[PDB]
């Protein structure tokens, strides 16, 4: 499925894994995908989140509260949670439906919003960003 990602979308999921590693987490969850969308910094997703006041620090602090730092450094490559896999599958479906041949950062964020139930979704709400508007603020930047 990675063959369909833009270079920057690829960067998002690489950074998501890096963030999971830094937190001593054993899975790449939707929350790590969220962190990766922010870390990527340049894409429509990063800009949408920045413009809705959703910060790397805000997300990190919520993840620390909800999940917490793990004790032991995990392996090099960390598997996705089932919910994160579902978000990536939905990201493809967003892009297809919108007539886009590639999956960009925008589509990963749209996919996350569409799944709408994982840790990332919970964090976004705790930080006062209703998921509906994230969709709005996104497709608008588009």
């Amino acid at each position: 499925m990675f063959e369909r990602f833009t270079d920057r979308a690829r960067r998002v999921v690489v950074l998501a894994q890096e963030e999971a590693r830094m937190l001593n987490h054993n899975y790449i969850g939707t929350e790590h995908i969220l962190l990766g969308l922010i870390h990527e910094g340049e894409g429509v997703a990063a800009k949408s989140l920045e413009s809705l006041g959703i910060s790397l620090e805000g997300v990190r602090s919520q993840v620390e509260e909800i999940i917490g730092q793990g004790q032991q450094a995990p392996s090099g490559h960390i598997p996705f949670t089932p919910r994160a896999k579902k978000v990536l599958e939905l990201s493809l479906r967003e892009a297809l439906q919108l007539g886009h041949n590639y999956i960009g950062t925008e589509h990963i964020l749209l996919g996350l919003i569409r799944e709408g139930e994982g840790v990332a979704a919970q964090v976004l709400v705790k930080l006062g960003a209703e998921l509906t508007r994230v969709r709005q603020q996104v497709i608008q930047l588009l």
């Binding site: 990675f2 999921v13 790449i28 490559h77 960390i78 598997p79």
Partner: peptide
């Protein structure tokens, strides 16, 4: 990859 056993090239893990 999108599963569990060993390292994908970039991100995640895969099964045989």
């Amino acid at each position: 990859g999108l599963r569990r056993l060993f390292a994908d090239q970039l991100v995640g893990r895969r099964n045989i």
